[PDB]
């Protein structure tokens, strides 16, 4: 039960770029700026009204990274007196920014919070470690790929994909079932995109092509000519006879979102248009070896706190990190597929780590309204063994 | 604006601070945070099973496991896997900010007991190779970019941190001589306090290699410093400037851990409280003079707590640069006999994420040693912010 009412007054997200694709030259700061500017504009929220900036970002991937939230705030015209915070709850960061914004409003340290999520995975650097203070002749120094090493949880020494294979084994999910889920995500993404279901949320970006400047407004990672036959032919990537392939895992990607939230007092004072109310949220830890299950206790705990049941949810979103991971969650919670990831997910449009939770939230806000539904919950598993969920109510 | 629930410090520890390339260089920021957290758990007789949330400040990701930091710390020190873990970045203020986030969580009843730390390994800051994933142009000038060095410039205003301090020196008419005398005083105060045992209760000693020895003294300090030696140093960034290597804080390695608890938790678990958190405040300011952050931060925090500067028995203003500190002292008319009484970052260094945790932990213990009632700790924040936290000693 939130101590004060907290309302979403704007929600936008960039198109998601493929790894090395159309957005590769924009930093995570840049992408976040683009989403935030679009949100301010779409909500007719004056920057002057923003009291706090909170950005989710996981992997620092530019020379200006440590300043990310502050630079976004300043670039979009929010006053210099407004403070700025960057947070990291890995894959859940896009949802977490909103959770921190809710807390600030609820203890009356803010009235209006810009809560975003962003990631540029294309920009993840190579790191040279241990050479500041001399080297030993004959040592084995790496140009370490900061992205690749970050996709292994060194506490349990598992790649994220292997934590998904664990769930495939535990929940009896076959390779065939994973590929069918992947196909459905592609189909759903395609249907939704072509129907306009991403129009209200989309923050188009001007990009360079060999054809000159163009407006990017469609997700680049999506593969709308996918067939089950093609997916069946892909080899498992991490495990012999495993379930996880390049076709049924989420892609590495670039992207951002921005959700602006406000107290009731602020909505009235500034004549904002509330689009949803934040009803509840929950963060839980879980076993790092099966981190993909995070959404199970996170959704359950959030529902419990809000006094709601899964049957009350018109929409559920569970971030598609890996098909077998998602399917495990579907089976554990007995989710109704007709109301879950209805417009595709990260298998189709990618998983920019910090950005996915902002996109999911922004999508739920607009899609819940489009359907005339009452409640939705968005969630993500989190590398290292956490989960997060946020429940919204249409206004 | 009182905290919605009482929040009490039940443990506060911090590691010795290591010099750049010094005694702690092989320990990751995760390692240092683990050490401080383990020392705090022990000092407060807090069972790891009682901790509901782990929040760690860390600024510059400097190890291959960095994105998982808070989660790994929590798991390594025995906190249950169900307890969630967040890493936050408000640059130089991060060590104070972790505590502020913990207060918020307790106040909205999402936690009862929070482990709130701050950590940095600046020795491990990598060199980054950028823009080589997707091909290079023959004749491009690829750098092994020093991630630390580039992070010490705010690219929004294109100023090294030291140049923002020169701006304050010009604005407030602070001479080079006055900066060097402030620096000498910090070295003298550090030395007197260390030898008197005033860092004993806070210190979380670490076993290091030399054979094995116990490190329990700050390594950056230069206790034979003289005004003449300082007078000979050249200004580093500005012709005839005030900032030198001798009167700026040093790059360093270190961490701290503060455990906070609700009143209910203190009573339920029979904790003995060391201080109560009375208030805090975060403010933005002009990035070109970011060092002035503590002025609105302290003023705002005092306002919210219903206190005045005269009520403070101790004030801490992180010593990022002597002229930056002196600009704060002048703007608020601080009493030097109650401000940075036991030295600061000029003497013992500024591990970005760790300084705010050390300051807090130092105030908790030093306030009790003096028999005082209130103290406020603060830091300027690169990019143009300030943070302050006020404590009250508790019987």
UniProtKB/Swiss-Prot annotation, chain A:
Pathway annotation from the record: Lipid metabolism; fatty acid beta-oxidation
Keywords: Acetylation, Acyltransferase, Fatty acid metabolism, Hydrolase, Lipid metabolism, Mitochondrion, Phosphoprotein, Transferase, Transit peptide
Modified residues (Phosphothreonine): 118, 135
Positions of the catalytic residues: 91 (acyl-thioester intermediate), 381 (proton donor/acceptor)
Residue numbers bearing the Phosphotyrosine modification: 126
Effect of residue 91 to S: Decreased acyl-CoA hydrolase activity
Molecular function terms, GO-annotated: acetyl-CoA C-acetyltransferase activity; acetyl-CoA C-acyltransferase activity; acetyl-CoA hydrolase activity; fatty acyl-CoA hydrolase activity; RNA binding
Binding site for CoA: 223, 226, 250
Chief localisation class: mitochondrion
Family statement drawn from the similarity comment of this UniProt entry: Belongs to the thiolase-like superfamily. Thiolase family.
Annotated function: In the production of energy from fats, this is one of the enzymes that catalyzes the last step of the mitochondrial beta-oxidation pathway, an aerobic process breaking down fatty acids into acetyl-CoA. Using free coenzyme A/CoA, catalyzes the thiolytic cleavage of medium- to long-chain unbranched 3-oxoacyl-CoAs into acetyl-CoA and a fatty acyl-CoA shortened by two carbon atoms. Also catalyzes the condensation of two acetyl-CoA molecules into acetoacetyl-CoA and could be involved in the production of ketone bodies. Also displays hydrolase activity on various fatty acyl-CoAs.
Name of the protein in its database record: 3-ketoacyl-CoA thiolase, mitochondrial
Source species: Homo sapiens (Human)
């Amino acid at each position: 039960a939130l101590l004060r009412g907290v309302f979403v007054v704007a929600a936008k997200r960039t198109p998601f770029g493929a790894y090395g694709g159309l957005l590769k030259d924009f930093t995570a700061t840049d992408l976040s700026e683009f989403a935030a500017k679009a949100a301010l504009s779409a909500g007719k929220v004056s920057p002057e009204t923003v009291d706090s900036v909170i950005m989710g970002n996981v992997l620092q991937s530019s020379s200006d990274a440590i300043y990310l939230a502050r630079h976004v705030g300043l670039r979009v015209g929010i006053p210099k007196e407004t403070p700025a915070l960057t947070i990291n709850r890995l894959c859940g960061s896009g949802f977490q920014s909103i959770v921190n914004g809710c807390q600030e409003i609820c203890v009356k340290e803010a009235e209006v919070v810009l809560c975003g999520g962003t990631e540029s995975m294309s920009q993840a650097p190579y790191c040279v470690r241990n050479v500041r203070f001399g080297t030993k002749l004959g040592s084995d120094i790496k140009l370490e790929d900061s992205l690749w090493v970050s996709l292994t949880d060194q506490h349990v020494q598992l790649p994220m994909a292997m934590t998904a294979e664990n769930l495939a084994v535990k929940h009896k999910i076959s390779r065939e079932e994973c590929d069918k889920y992947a196909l459905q995500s592609q189909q759903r993404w395609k249907a939704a995109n072509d129907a306009g279901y991403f129009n209200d949320e989309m923050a188009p970006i001007e990009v360079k092509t060999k054809k000159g400047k163009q407006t990017m407004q469609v997700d680049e990672h999506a593969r709308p000519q996918t067939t089950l036959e093609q997916l069946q032919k892909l080899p498992p990537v991490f495990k012999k006879d495993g379930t996880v392939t390049a076709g049924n895992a989420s892609g590495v990607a670039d992207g951002a979102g921005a959700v602006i939230i406000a107290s009731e007092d602020a909505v009235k004072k500034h004549n904002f248009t509330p689009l949803a109310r934040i009803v509840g949220y929950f963060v839980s830890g879980c076993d790092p070896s099966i981190m993909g299950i995070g959404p199970v206790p996170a959704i359950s705990g959030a529902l419990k706190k809000a006094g709601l049941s899964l049957k009350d949810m018109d929409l559920v979103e569970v971030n598609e990190a890996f098909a077998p991971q998602y399917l495990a969650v579907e089976r554990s919670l007995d989710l109704d597929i007709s109301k879950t990831n209805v417009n595709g997910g990260a298998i189709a449009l990618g998983h920019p780590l910090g950005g996915s939770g902002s996109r999911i939230t922004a999508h739920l806000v607009h899609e819940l309204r489009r359907r005339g539904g009452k409640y939705a919950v968005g969630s993500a598993c989190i590398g290292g063994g956490q989960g997060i969920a946020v429940i919204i109510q249409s206004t």
